[PDB]
Design a protein around this nucleic acid. Structure first.
Lengths: 462, 459
RNA sequence: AAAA
């Protein structure tokens, strides 16, 4: 019917008939008629409120799309070059077209126009037709369409497909055009969203990367992102000093990674590190639960965690960095005190010891010994001077100048912004506290079943 | 060269009955191809590509131009069953080995899969995604894939053969006016994703990290709008960092920018009254921290409010942190009620009568006898509270002895408490009692200040 | 290559 008309149109062009105008006179009334009757919309017709169409110099295409989507309000992203075809378009579709002028390659302004129209019509179904117009114009429209259904699920990118295309006439064969709704590539490639999780993980926003991954197991039915979620949850908890949780998640990950099904999960190409880390968490959670400094591995893990936390907060959470480093030094020092028999909270000071400690503290804080009251618990500076006086070897290596600086720092624990007190801690002092804590940490590391490994996270492997 | 002559002759020939496709192939295409073999016309500038990737439709001369212009060593050609035919013509024109991949004429998911693949296998090299030839659905699939993977494969350039004169009747570019053009990535240019992440962090409290995203947003967008945004997140970071001078500096900078002509319509101006208020609070706190004078009720209130809100944020996860913030807020609110009485918690000039009444107060509270109670030199949290109740303090006096009983273990929670002197994540209800007491004292203090949440980002 |  139309196929006969198309064959006779080809014959007509082969007779020297000018193909633009000949097509408009001969074929186009018939094809336009069929579409005004039964718009060919491939995955059945869909109910659209607004359609947005690029317009190029084949307005018949845009006509087909406008009828096919059947929208009420119709926008036409056209170029200065294709503006001249709006009137005929309007007369064909019998629709009032809101025109918008855009460059023929202004991908960017196309895309902004789509974001504008979408926000003008947020809750209603929208057909973004990219049929007519340059590839750049369609790139704008399609980038915006495929990106914005995350936020406007009712927005559908559409095109006028054909099932037969004439390469000499550079037209579809009349009657073989249909309007194909196009799927979003973020349906069957939801897995690619992992890179966002990979990025959220790569900045250390573990809590967020974990929520992202749990979404991934919910979005694309894969359970393998659940293992990533486990790892990220582990790091969030570990950074939070929630070693109980940190371990719960890490153990769950190592159990899953044990299974035959996850033998190939990329996290396995890091298992030696992962295992080490969860063991650290084990060591800490036991030590935290035991509170005895005999568990050198747990003390090491808590000290290394605290010092890691203070290091990464050294510039943008200075008061928090101080908190972390002060607690780390107290830990390492108290472990040193357990080594030499005693425990700082109720050390048994001999009177000779109390006088030795008072003399050291005096000639460290710059007072006469008779000004010195010994507190019942050894606080941080008392512990420092006392371990020094009991011959703790690593602490011996401290010449009285860096010791004086540490004493100055140490009086800022007794009062600070987050302690019962008021002063924001000097970053010089905090770095000195952390340098001494780091030295003790390495001493301790030389002494643990763990050996070395770091809080810093294992690669996702993807 | 004047292939313009040839193009006019080719037009002359078609208008007189000639086949446009064959005639283009014999008159125009040789000459045009000659010129593009000499000097490929790449708009921004030619750029070395490891790999170019071209959708191919029934106009292989387009993908030929695109191949020549991108000059990539390794050339994929996405094609359809219906366009596979032209692969030999393309091979001849480009003199280049091709890596054809067959795809459906509307297989947007597949262009997508293919880009994911080629990019993974060539992750760290410049790759041009040319969407010239083929269907709008084909180019659209390549473009979606490109603009998306560009973030993670930053050497990727989505490119396309533009033309400065398109013969609508020949449905062809006029020969010579074509040019290969790096299309801007709109996702990048607008940094919609960096915004979405920065919004996520900003809402979730990760102010410093949102700030870094905004600062990078400036460079990706060329729009200093996001500089202001960075400043805002900057200030909130410094504020939660408890560095109120840093927060005040940044906030004032921001208010000075939002005062300017350029940023009258900046979306943060939609909440300017808030910002103004908050920056005033910043100054209040900053003045008070500089003076430690508790007549500065607005500074004391702001800093107690800051601590109480940090202890609200952290209680879910930072748990220890949440208690430290709560204790600090309570000790603060308490020192302010105490300063209202002319007394300093730090050294109470308590007369021997007050010492007796405070040992007595703590005895009755804790249930022990008064000489079990040894009064410290600095009034501790519970001691401060019992001394305010001693001294006629109305809000603290309105606390039942059983409430103070249930609270006194919580105010014993200090020390212990992993980040202080022990190993305890103090109980969420332990933190709760402190935080609600502090909330009451905070609201009371808020009344006595003439001043009487981070602000929405506006997107 | 501005309905492949």
């Amino acid at each position: 019917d139309l196929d006969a008309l198309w064959e006779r149109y080809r014959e007509a062009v082969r007779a020297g008939g000018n193909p633009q105008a000949l097509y408009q006179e001969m074929v186009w009334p018939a094809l336009l008629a069929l579409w005004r009757e039964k718009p060919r919309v491939y995955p059945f017709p869909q109910a659209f409120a607004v359609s947005v169409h690029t317009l190029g110099t084949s307005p018949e295409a845009t006509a087909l799309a406008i009828l096919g989507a059947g929208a009420e309000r119709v926008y036409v992203l056209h170029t200065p070059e294709s503006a001249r075809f709006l009137p005929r378009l309007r007369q064909d579709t019998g629709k009032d077209l809101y025109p918008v002028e855009i460059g023929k390659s202004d991908v960017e302004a196309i895309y902004r126009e789509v974001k504008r129209l979408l926000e003008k019509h947020p809750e209603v179904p929208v057909a973004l037709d990219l049929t007519s117009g340059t590839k750049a114009m369609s790139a704008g429209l399609a980038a915006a369409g495929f990106f914005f259904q995350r936020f406007y699920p009712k927005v559908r990118v559409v095109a006028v497909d054909n099932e037969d295309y004439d390469p000499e006439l550079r037209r579809p064969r009349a009657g073989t055009e249909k309007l194909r709704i196009l799927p979003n590539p973020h349906e069957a490639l939801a897995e690619v969203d992992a890179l966002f999780a990979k990025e959220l993980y790569g900045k250390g926003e573990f809590g967020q990367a974990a929520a992202y991954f749990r979404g991934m197991v919910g979005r694309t039915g894969n359970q393998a992102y659940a293992l990533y979620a486990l790892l990220a949850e582990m790091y969030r908890a570990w950074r939070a000093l929630d070693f109980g949780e940190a371990l719960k998640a890490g153990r769950k990950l190592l159990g899953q990674l044990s299974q035959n099904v996850w033998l190939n999960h990329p996290l396995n190409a890091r298992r030696e590190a992962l295992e080490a880390q969860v063991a650290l968490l084990e060591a800490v959670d036991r030590f935290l639960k035991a509170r005895d400094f005999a568990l050198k591995e747990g003390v090491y893990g808590l000290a290394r965690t605290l010092l890691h936390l203070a290091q990464e907060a050294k510039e943008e959470a200075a008061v928090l960095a101080a908190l972390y480093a002060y607690r780390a030094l107290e830990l390492l020092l108290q472990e040193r005190l357990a080594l030499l028999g005693r425990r700082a909270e109720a050390p048994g000071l001999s009177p000779e010891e109390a006088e030795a400690l008072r003399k050291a503290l005096a000639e460290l804080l710059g007072v006469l010994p008779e000004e010195v009251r010994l507190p019942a618990k050894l606080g941080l500076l008392d512990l420092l001077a006392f371990l020094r006086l009991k011959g703790d070897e690593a602490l011996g290596r401290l010449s009285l100048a860096e010791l004086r600086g540490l004493a100055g720092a140490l009086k800022g624990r007794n009062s600070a912004l987050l302690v019962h007190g008021f002063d924001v801690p000097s970053p010089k002092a905090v770095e000195g506290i952390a340098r001494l804590a780091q030295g003790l940490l390495q001493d301790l590391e030389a002494r643990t079943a763990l050996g070395p490994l770091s809080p810093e996270p294992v690669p996702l492997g993807f």
